[PDB]
Amino acid sequence: SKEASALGVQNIGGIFIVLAAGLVLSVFVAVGEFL
Amino acid sequence: AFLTVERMESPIDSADDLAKQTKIEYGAVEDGATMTFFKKSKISTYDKMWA
Lengths: 35, 51
Description:
This is part of a larger assembly, with 2 copies of chain A. By secondary structure, the first copy, chain A, is mainly α.
């Protein structure tokens, strides 16, 4: 009966990794756009 | 989830609703004619109360 726990870092931790991966992929594909 | 947790429990918690729930503490005089009727006289929710 004790479940009033928020979506903490343990509950959601991979979102930072996926956004960082998206950012690095975006810059890595944008640098090649000029070439 | 928060809303379901707060609403599945009975806010009015009338009688039998107390047996199923365990968050709220409850009790009385030990064997002071309170649970003497509950150890015997098996009634479902009253049996849960005795347990």
